[PDB]
Structure formats: C-alpha cells, structure tokens
Design a protein around this ligand. Sequence first.
Ligand SMILES: Nc1ncnc2c1ncn2[C@@H]1O[C@H](CSCC[C@H](N)C(=O)O)[C@@H](O)[C@H]1O
Ligand SMILES: [Cl-]
Ligand SMILES: [Cl-]
Ligand SMILES: [Cl-]
Length: 261
Amino acid sequence: RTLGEQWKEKLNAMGKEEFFSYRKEAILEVDRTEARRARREKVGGHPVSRGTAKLRWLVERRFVQPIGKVVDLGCGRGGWSYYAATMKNVQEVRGYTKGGPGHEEPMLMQSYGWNIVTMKSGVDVFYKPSEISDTLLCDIGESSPSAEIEEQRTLRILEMVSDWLSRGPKEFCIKILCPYMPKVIEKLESLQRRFGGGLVRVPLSRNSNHEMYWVSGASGNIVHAVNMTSQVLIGRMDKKIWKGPKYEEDVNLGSGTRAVG
Ligand SMILES: Nc1ncnc2c1ncn2[C@@H]1O[C@H](CSCC[C@H](N)C(=O)O)[C@@H](O)[C@H]1O
Ligand SMILES: [Cl-]
Ligand SMILES: [Cl-]
Ligand SMILES: [Cl-]
C-alpha cells in the first residue's frame, strides 16, 4: 500500500487525546476566536470560515490568481467566495452549495465586494450542468476512515470538475480529498496533462486529513508531491513532545460595495 494508506490506518487507530494533539501538531493555524465569536451577532471583515485563510495562503504565493467570473463549487458559508470578491481582477463570483440539514448554508456578508457575490444553496453539483468561467474553485470532499470510500468520492469530484475545466478557466483551485490512492493519482496525472497545474499541501490543513489542492500555478511530479506530504504527516505522529500549532492573523476582508473593471 501507499504511504498515505499507512498514515490513514495509523490515524484511525489513534486515541482521543493523541488525535487531538496530533491534528494541530506543527500546522499553521488562524486565530479564529475573534472571527467566530461574531457568529451569534457583517461589516467587520471577519471571514465566515477558516477556509478563507487557506485560499489566501495559495493566492499570496501565486498558486492561483482569481480573475473575471469566479465559480465556487461547494461554497458552503462562502469563505472562498467572499475572499475572491476582494481580488483586483475579479468581476463576478458565483457560489453553489448543497445546504440543507447537516450542511452549511451561505452566510450573507457585507465584506468588500459583496455586491458581486451570489451564492445559491440547494445545488448538488453532481447534477449541475457546467457553465463558462475564468476561475474555477472547488472545495468539496467528505472525509471517511476508509481510503477506498474517499478514493471513489475523489474520483467522482474529478469527473465532475473536468466538465467545468474544459470550459476554459485558466485559474483553478480544486480540493483533492484523497490524493494518495493509486486510482486518484492516475486520474490526476491525466488531468494534469490535460489542464496543467500541480498539487500543493496547504500548511493550514490539519494533520487529520491528507487533502491537497490542485492549483493552476503549481507544477511538478504528483506522485512525489503526494509522497512527501504523506511522510511529513507520518513524521508528526507519536512525537515525544507536542509543540502545537503556529499562529497567523486571520484574513481581513474589509467592507462595502466595490467597483469592477
Ligand atoms: N454534492 C455537493 N454539492 C454541493 N455542495 C456540496 C456537495 N457536497 C458537499 N458540499 C458542500 O461543500 C462544502 C465544502 S466546505 C467549503 C468551505 C468553503 N471553501 C469556505 O471557505 O467556507 C460544504 O459546505 C458541503 O456542504
Ligand atoms: Cl464527497
Ligand atoms: Cl478587515
Ligand atoms: Cl472600489
């Protein structure tokens, strides 16, 4: 089996306290306390989720550069959608998410560029015909203790996103739930040859998942990138002393309506 599969099994065998220490070991973490305390209480620029910080991390390093019409698949509360709205060359943001019981509904915010954001709930993207976009974002992937179940879920997401990518967005950022399973690596290699990009591990991701982002501004060997992530994750297991996370300031999303080019 792959190193990721080994990681997965060891993760599944962990105790409660061990698991909770491990998931944040040596990760980058946003101080969400201030943002999430404003949940029960929209112009303060506080992001709706920790997802915003992940997208900033990628954009800040030019792994993706949102432009024109942005489509955000599985937008949830809208962390990525509202971040995209603050990008210089973005003109429109369209978010889709399933919502309903047990799932996130879009949160209407008045952060900067809110006037160009529309998010629609009650949309299962596996039945949604594709549309033209300039930037395609997708953050879909339900975790499972089974790598085989995650593999199938990941292949289904990849089949679905291929339709959107064939519409010509040059900028994209797609969550790969289970990048380490053989069938997923195979599909990624064909899609990389077809659409470009590469896989990046965002250090804000918890050690409890192996998610990697397929992004347009990356390049290089997928197998190697996945393997190095597996080894780093396994390397953080069973430490003698837990050092904990490293903290960074949350994203500032500003306020009010925006002009677009
Ligand atoms: N088949 C499907 N169709 C539409 N949305 C789905 C879906 N399966 C899962 N989702 C949604 O996809 C979301 C992924 S989490 C999205 C986080 C977002 N990037 C942010 O920054 O806030 C979840 O809210 C989940 O409800
Ligand atoms: Cl899924
Ligand atoms: Cl702000
Ligand atoms: Cl403006």
